Every structure is written in C-alpha cells, then in structure tokens.
Symmetry: C2
Subunit: 450 residues, 2 copies
C-alpha cells in the first residue's frame, strides 16, 4: 500500500493549482523574471519521514526564510544577553519607523524584519570576526540543518546588491544608533548573500523539522541546536513571522511560519511537523499566495494547529500491574512535564502512606465530579489518561489483602526524557523509598541520570 | 507519599511572596481597598487533577479574565460569521483609536480589549434577546466550565457602574458604527455585571483546563464546548491577551493567558494544563505583578511553554508483533494527526505490495542519513518514534519466510480519536485490503466510526 499523506499533498497541489493569482517579486529583476508556473510542497516528520508533491526539488533563494536560522546561530555564538541587547521581541510591519530605535532599548523590533536581520548578521561569530567568517557561519548553520552543503546564488546576490538602497538605509540607521559596528556596506553584503542561499521545498521542510523537534535532526537523531534556542526561534516566527497579520494568522492557521519573496514558505509546528512550500507568486502583502493558502489547508484538513493539543498525557504510563506484593510500573514515550506529571499521579495513587489526600474539591459541592470520578476508567478514556488509573486499581481491591513493598520502574519503552522529567521522576522515587517501599529502577540504556 | 507538584507551588508562593510590588486597581474604590496581602495559585490537569497553594480559595471578581468565556458562548450562540463581523483578530493596546473602526471592517480589534468585549456581550444570545437573557447566558457559560453556579458581586458592579464613563464611551462609539444595536447603557451594564462574577484561583484553573483540553471538562469528561470554538479562544488569548507585550510574553513565558484587574490570571496551555493565579497588586501595565511572574516561573522550571513540543508521536503504536502469518498492531493514547500519521507509517512499513518506496532523499547525497537509518531502533529513540519501527522489523527477517495475510488492529488501549484520525486510519485500512490483506478491527468500545 502507498502512504496516503503524499496523495493528499498531490490532490492539494492540483486543487489549489487550478489558479495562480499575484505577482513574482518585482523589485529584483532575477526574481521578477523567474517562472511562475511552479508549485511544490513537502512535509518532514519528527521521526524522519518526508512526504512531498509538485515542484519540491526545485531550488530557489531562501530570502527571509533564512532569518530564523541566522538568529539561531547568533544565539549560540553570542548568548541571549548579547543578542537581545541588539534585537527585540515585538511584532511589527516591515515599514520602518525610527521611533523603534529611540526607545531606551535602541534596537529593531524583532529578527523577522530586515532591520532585525541585519543586526543578527552583524553578531554572527564574534566581535573580531571577518566579513568572510560571518558569511559562511550563516551558510554553515543552514547547511547543518538541511543536512548538506548549501551554496549562494551569486547571480541573485549581484542582482540585489545593485538595488539595495533600502537595506543600506536600514544598516546606516542601525549604525548611528550603535546596533551595527562594522560598515553598512559590509553588513548588507553579508545579509544579501545570506538571502541568496539556495534551498528546495524539501530542504526547508527538514530545516523546519529541526526547529519543530526542539533542535534534534530528524534524519540522524543528533542535536544540532539546544532546545532553548529553538524555542525562541519558533516563538518569534509565530509572533512576528506574518507581521501585523500574525494575530489573524495564528487563529486561522496556527502554524509558526515565514515566507520569502522568492516563493518559499517555512513552517515548523513543535512536536509535529516541518513544512516547506514553494510558489513564486506573492499576494498583496508580499507572501507566497499559494504557499500560505496551502498552510491554511493543512491546518484545516488535519487540525495541524498550534492550539490543537497533542500531548502524551497519561499514556506515559504503559501499564500498572499488581503482581502480588510488588507492583510493576512501566513507562513509555518521550517523557517531559506532561508524562512526568502523570507518572507522579500513578506513584501517589498507590497507598504507600496514610491516605489522607486533598481531593482539591468538595465532593458535597460537586456531586457531578464525584460521580464521574466513581468510574475512573470511563473518565480516563474521556480526557486521555492512559493507564495511570491502573494505579488506583492496584491499590484497590488488591490492597484489601496485602501491602505494597516493592516497586519496579521499567524505562525500557521510554525513548528519552528531559531534565524536568528526570528531576520530577527522581523526586517521586525519593519519596517512595521514604515510605519504606523498595524501589528498583530497570533502566537498560541508562537514561534516568542527569 | 505526597504529590511533589503542590509542594513546588508552596515553595514558589513563599519565594515570590517575599515581596509584593505594584498597586491594587485604583480606578474602582472597592478594588483599591481590597487586601493586598494575598497570593494563591492552582493547576488543573487534563485528566482531572487539581494542585494548589496559598490563597487559592479566595473569591474575587474575574473581570477581564471573563472575556475569553463570553467570546466562547457568543461563537456557539451565533456562529463564527456573525461574530467575526463584529469582533476582529488583531492585537493592540487597550488605548482606543477610532481609526480601528473606520476600516472597511467596522469592528474593534479583538475580544480581549474592552471595546471588543462589549461587542461580544451584545451578541450573546440572539438579536431578540433581553438584557436579562444575555446576562445569565454569560453567568451560565462561566458556571458550566467552573462546574458550579457562580454569582455576581453587585457591590463591585454598583461601585464600577458609578464610574463607567470610559466603557460608556466605547459603547457609544461602537453604536455610531453599528457594532452595537441596543443602548450603550444596557450593553455596558451587562458587561460590568459580567466582570463582577466571583471566582477563586481554583475555578479559573478548571475553567482554563476546559479550554486546554479542546473543550472537554476534566472532572467529568463531557464536552462543554466544541474544539473549534476553544481553539479560537486560546488563539486570541495568546495573540492579544498581553496586548502590545504579547510578543515578549509568548517568547519568555509561552502560556496563553489573561489577567484581570482584581488580581486574577487565567492560563490555558493546550493539552497540558489550566492555570489560575491570584495576587491583588498590579504592575505598571495593569496585570497581576506576581500572577504573571508566577506564570514565568512555571514556564522556566517545567518548560510549560507552547513552543516546547509534547506530542504522542510514534507512541500511538503500542507494539507490532509478527506472530506468524498474521501481524498484531495495537494502538494507544489520544489519536489525532500525530498518532494517525505514525500509524500510517507502521502499516506502510510492512511489505503488502511491491516495495518500490520513495525514500524521499538520495542516499548517495546523504550518507549520514542512510547510516542513521541503518539502525532504526536508535534513530527511533533519538526522535521519539515509539514502536512504529517494529513494523519494518516484522516485515524484516520474518518476511524472508512467509508473506503477511492478515492484520489485526486493536484499539482497546486507545482513549479516543478525532475525525482526522478516523478518516486517516480508515483510509489506511482501505488500502491494506486493496493489497489482498485481511484486516480485522478489534474495537471493543466502538470508537472507530464517524
Ligand atoms: N532579500 C529581501 C527580503 C526578501 C523577503 O522578505 O523574503 C530584502 O529585502
Ligand atoms: N472591568 C474593567 C476591566 C478590568 C480588567 O482589565 O481586567 C473595565 O474596564
């Protein structure tokens, strides 16, 4: 059988491809002349899968879509403090107002706008880095997430460098205020080359997947960026990626994304998917007309919306078996606060101490809640509590005859766990032993420690 | 053993409670006189748990935090089309500019600002609803999610009704532009009473949990609102809840939230938690000083950030066993696109047709990717692919001797599945049978159908 997702993409391409409104980027001859009859799309999954359709192997300059990647590198190369002092976090239109730098901050609004991107480039390696080191540091970060050595299309670079008065304007203003140190020409040159890096709809998908996983490369499993750094990048994509229309975009689509004037659109939905879309023509506000509509389709047909929750929940608890005197509690999935939290519910739901719990709510006041609670399997199916309820069960009819003396924690089925999970699950075990309960942790591939 | 989460909350209360900067809402005597020495916090989980600390049982007028609830009711009572024609989706400051209504839209920016909240109230039941029907329709929606009959503090209502010139101003302007039909006095009266509804830190937590689950009540499991309606509410909370500071807030905290001038703060992080915080004093921008700082603490200590993914992923696949000629594929958790997607990977990863797959990537170009792929168990642990890889395994060495003829899909361990999951998993099964493979669906509590 053939995977049905790519067939969905092919249908979407054909349906939305029935028309092609808008225009190709006019302010740069090379892009205005590009072939408009192109439309491709790709989805890179968290686990390493790649679905596509249409022109998804056609290279094009990434332009603005490169902004979240250089921001990432700047954060790793200089640290938050140095970068935040130069780049802000507020949404705004690309139209520039000097008043935004007059603030006691003296820094452009965010990293998605040109002025902010020029400050990011300037920060790329260190204060004593040359023009060349910063350029390939840019090319390097994009290349490392794309999984292959990328190149700069000098034809576009030269084409744009000849009509770069606006960005030179932005760079000179930024210097007067001290956000740039080197020359306006030098920083603008590096950013224009940066925007000229060539990628395909599939490179973007994979690059976006790196951000969606929190920094881990989906095709290898190695960490390319620290999760805290990726969180900030996807955060700014959502609040500023679509400028003044971000509010409308978050609600109707709900996907962190950034478009580029060459037709490309980058998407990255944490924990679920990396998206790459390509369609030359732009709408009245500068984005890829079909590129963004296609994102809206993916969101409406699949509910791939940042506000549509998809958590591990109680499913972190694979099962709870009360063999006899000992209890077997197995865990699974990627454990973070979500799973760790449920785990703590399981452990606590065993009577390993005088059970004088704090319901939290007055049963007398909420008769409905008590009734619903009376059937824990039903309520657990309606919310999504996995096998956590098997804990109250083990401590149920089974405790009527015999106390629990040993608890085995098996983590074989667990893929990974962050520090938050580790510290929480650790504490839960520390408190078990305190109840005079034996606790043995069966962890084949030592994952538990910090 | 005692659950460690509430102990964390108690520590946080004591730590952040060491100081108490800001002022109580001054523009309404009753609130300016309220006792500032109060600080409580509560967390309501998706599965029905409630952790708390400090003054979390003290009632206070919900004020602005009521806005996302009336918006929800308006959406259900009138439908998106009627409501969107009166209320926009763009962020903005509470400071009012007439220019926002002059747009061809002729509607206030969003539902979080007063002007937008007044339009929401006006729409509450129907065009022919009385002043009274709209007031209790408001009280009703908040009461239904809080799980108990709430009441209006008329003392605050009268106190505020005596100094409601600003909101009357907003209501009269909205009438001139046709966003309100009834009198300015009537709509303002209903909204001020609306803001006077009394709730505790724990009511908010639970009310917020209703939004975080996509509309399902955590203490009962019954649907209080349709998921599409909750998605829109949490979407606007994130983009407009914190006004012009939403960008900064999304990045540093990442929690959909709204504060109220009485000291309360509502939080709702899809799929993970409903939050309620109370702390009378407000900062220089009108929010609960400690209320918001406490949200920042929860986000930094637990990584309870909208951009920190927590997806079910491959864990939707509990396990894949190749008993012999038949294969057993069990599923678990709350299946949506995330799980359904992985399921489709499992099914496809079996050779039930001439295996001429589309790698998606050129192995020659990405030697690293091929190597990593060579060890599917390792790569599946590094990304978080659950037991989906057991599919390629069943179709592995095992297929060297004998083809697969029957596939059993067990959904007993699955809690629930949306339409997206149903349609996708359905299609995957339709395509299996097409390969001449027998497919038997073991679904005890008929969940599959649409
Ligand atoms: N390279 C362009 C930016 C294109 C874009 O917005 O994607 C300058 O200006
Ligand atoms: N009831 C207030 C709103 C308070 C708030 O912003 O929470 C009016 O104005």
């Amino acid at each position: 059988m053939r995977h049905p997702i790519p067939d969905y993409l092919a249908s979407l391409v054909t349906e939305l491809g029935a028309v092609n409104p808008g225009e190709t980027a006019q302010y740069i001859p090379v892009l205005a002349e590009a072939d408009p009859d192109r439309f491709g799309i790709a989805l890179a999954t968290p686990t390493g899968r790649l679905h596509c359709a249409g022109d998804a192997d056609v290279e094009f300059t990434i332009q603005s879509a490169s902004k979240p990647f250089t921001y990432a590198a700047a954060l790793v190369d200089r640290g938050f403090a140095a970068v935040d002092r130069q780049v802000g976090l507020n949404p705004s239109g690309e139209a520039f107002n000097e008043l935004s730098l007059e603030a006691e901050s003296h820094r452009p609004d965010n990293a998605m706008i040109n002025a902010g991107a020029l400050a990011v480039h300037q920060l790329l390696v260190g204060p004593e880095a040359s023009r060349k080191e910063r350029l390939d540091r840019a090319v390097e970060i994009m290349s490392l997430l794309a999984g292959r050595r990328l190149s700069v299309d000098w034809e576009t670079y030269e084409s744009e460098m000849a009509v770069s008065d606006r960005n030179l304007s932005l760079a000179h203003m930024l210097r007067s205020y001290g956000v740039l140190q080197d020359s306006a020409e030098e920083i603008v040159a590096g950013y224009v080359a940066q925007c000229a890096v060539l990628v395909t709809v599939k490179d973007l998908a994979v690059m976006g997947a790196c951000l969606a996983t929190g920094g881990i490369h989906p095709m290898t499993g190695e960490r390319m960026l620290p999760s805290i750094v990726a969180r900030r990048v996807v955060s700014v994509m959502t609040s500023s990626g679509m400028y003044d229309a971000a509010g409308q975009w978050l609600a109707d689509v709900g996907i962190p994304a950034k478009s580029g004037v060459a037709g490309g659109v980058l998407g990255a939905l944490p924990g679920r998917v990396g998206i790459g879309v390509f369609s030359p023509r732009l709408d009245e506000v500068g984005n890829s007309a079909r590129g963004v509509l296609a994102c809206r389709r993916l969101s409406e047909d699949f509910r791939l919306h940042l506000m549509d929750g998809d958590s591990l929940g109680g499913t972190a608890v694979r099962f709870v078996e009360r063999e006899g005197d000992r209890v077997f509690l197995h865990l699974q999935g990627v454990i973070r606060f979500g799973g760790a939290e449920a785990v703590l519910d399981a452990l606590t739901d065993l009577r390993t101490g005088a059970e004088k719990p704090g319901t939290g709510w007055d049963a007398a006041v909420y008769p409905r809640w008590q009734e619903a609670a009376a059937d824990r399997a039903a309520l657990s199916a309606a919310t999504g509590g996995g096998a956590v309820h098997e804990a109250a069960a083990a401590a149920a009819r089974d405790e009527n005859d015999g106390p629990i003396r040993t608890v085995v924690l098996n983590l074989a089925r667990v893929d990974r766990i962050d520090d938050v999970g580790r510290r929480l699950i650790a504490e839960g075990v520390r408190r078990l032993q305190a109840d005079g309960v034996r606790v043995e942790v069966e962890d084949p591939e030592r994952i538990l420690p910090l």
